[PDB]
């Protein structure tokens, strides 16, 4: 899929989580939101287009994907492990990573 | 010194890295966030003055302020080997653990 | 491919980035390697077969593969900026997730 | 005190934390570690006294330490949380940064 369709699948999946009072609503929302990752690290910003697609500025790019990735990953093992509010917790610091692609590269 | 007086050291030395245009600048506002953040280690938010000094709330509080001394500690590394810009943006990642400590605590 | 398989690729694949003369053959090396932990992360160990697969035990065994695919990802990204010898040095570190693993499970 | 003198505190209570029956013999021997790798930060190896004391070498050298210390750090955290095993298991992943340091320095 599109990158802003990525964008906006991560971000109206991380209110989500937010607001959530499940568990597998936590666990569902964080599974779109790595495969939306996924999709998005194989994709080239409007900003970096003319960038190459072995540029240092798009390999920073593509592993501001990978880090979000791991972010998640570590947030569905909790979830998995009972630790509802922990996981929620975890998926907030995701926060960081979106800011810090963005700001750089948004 | 006091905890807001660590505070107010720390939030109008990350405007000065931020607005920096020399490295000794920077490295200077680090070093003075550093000692603040080592000052605001050992003391009490209004939160948690009602929980013991053992108590894991006050154990995770304390570890907020050893995580951002750590954060501190390498970005006055990329200072001292001459990357400016690298520091400052080490500084500016300075703002999830920040954030991290007020959203759980303040 | 069998875990021993793999294990055997990761072993024999490693002396070889620890013996590299050229840049390439530690970045084909570690190719192989992240394919063979990628493999053997869905496997199951002689020690854990009784245990569920959504064991704790079976999920910690996982994981040590998730950490070093992460550990053998930035070792690639060091071997594409041309630093060749830091790749290496990245590659001697993972024998301390190899014996994690070992240890534990093994 | 002397730098052999700091890793023969190091090394012998390692061995005490792995073969230990009592939490408080994990948590002691920890602290002493601690306050061994914290003396061992300022010393300089005889493989870089020539070096100076602002060489990279010697920078990644005390950074060995830096990392040594947070590690043990949140060994500690473990043993005090009750995690006596974990705690056993954190000390035991000392041994790469030990590794690390001597193989590139001893
Ligand atoms: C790069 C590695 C990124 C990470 C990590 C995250 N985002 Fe992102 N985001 C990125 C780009 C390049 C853009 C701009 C898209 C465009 O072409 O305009 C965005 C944009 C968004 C948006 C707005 C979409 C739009 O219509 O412009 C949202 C709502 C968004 N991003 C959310 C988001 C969230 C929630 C993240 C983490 C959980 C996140 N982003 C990470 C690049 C990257
Ligand atoms: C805990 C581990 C913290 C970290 C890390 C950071 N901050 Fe903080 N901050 C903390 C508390 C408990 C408070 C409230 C103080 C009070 O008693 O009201 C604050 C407050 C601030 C403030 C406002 C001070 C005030 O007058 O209320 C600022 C401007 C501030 N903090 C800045 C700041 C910066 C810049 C940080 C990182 C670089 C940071 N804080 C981290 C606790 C913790
Ligand atoms: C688990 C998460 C592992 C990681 C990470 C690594 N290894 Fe491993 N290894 C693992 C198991 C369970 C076994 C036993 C296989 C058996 O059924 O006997 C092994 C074994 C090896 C072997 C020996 C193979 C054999 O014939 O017994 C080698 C040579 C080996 N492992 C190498 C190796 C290397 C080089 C690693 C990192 C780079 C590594 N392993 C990580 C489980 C896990
Ligand atoms: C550097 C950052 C180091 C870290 C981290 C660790 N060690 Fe070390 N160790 C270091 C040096 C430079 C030396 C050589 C001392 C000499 O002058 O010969 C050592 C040596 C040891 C020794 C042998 C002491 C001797 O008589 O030669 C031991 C037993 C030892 N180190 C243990 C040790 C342990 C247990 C560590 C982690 C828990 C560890 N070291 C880390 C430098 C560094
Ligand atoms: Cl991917
Ligand atoms: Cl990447
Ligand atoms: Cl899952
Ligand atoms: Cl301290
Ligand atoms: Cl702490
Ligand atoms: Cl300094
Ligand atoms: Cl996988
Ligand atoms: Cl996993
Ligand atoms: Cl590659
Ligand atoms: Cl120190
Ligand atoms: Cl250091
Ligand atoms: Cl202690
Ligand atoms: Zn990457
Ligand atoms: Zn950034
Ligand atoms: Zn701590
Ligand atoms: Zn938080
Ligand atoms: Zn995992
Ligand atoms: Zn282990
Ligand atoms: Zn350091
Ligand atoms: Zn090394």
Same mark, same amino acid.
Request: net charge negative.
């Given at each position: 899929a599109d990158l802003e369709d990525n964008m906006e699948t991560l971000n109206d999946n991380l209110k989500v989580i937010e607001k959530a009072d499940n568990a597998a609503q936590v666990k569902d929302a964080l599974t779109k939101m790595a495969a939306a990752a996924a999709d998005a690290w194989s994709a080239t910003p409007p900003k970096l287009? /003319?960038?190459?697609? /072995?540029s240092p500025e798009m390999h920073d790019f593509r592993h501001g994907f990978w880090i979000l990735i791991g972010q998640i990953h570590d947030a569905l093992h909790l979830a998995n492990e009972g630790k509802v509010k922990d996981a929620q917790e975890a998926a907030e610091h995701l926060k960081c990573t979106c800011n810090h692609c963005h700001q750089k590269y948004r």
């Amino acid at each position: 899929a599109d990158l802003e369709d990525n964008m906006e699948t991560l971000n109206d999946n991380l209110k989500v989580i937010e607001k959530a009072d499940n568990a597998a609503q936590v666990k569902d929302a964080l599974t779109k939101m790595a495969a939306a990752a996924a999709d998005a690290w194989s994709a080239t910003p409007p900003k970096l287009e /003319d960038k190459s697609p /072995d540029s240092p500025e798009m390999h920073d790019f593509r592993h501001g994907f990978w880090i979000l990735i791991g972010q998640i990953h570590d947030a569905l093992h909790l979830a998995n492990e009972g630790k509802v509010k922990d996981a929620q917790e975890a998926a907030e610091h995701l926060k960081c990573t979106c800011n810090h692609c963005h700001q750089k590269y948004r």
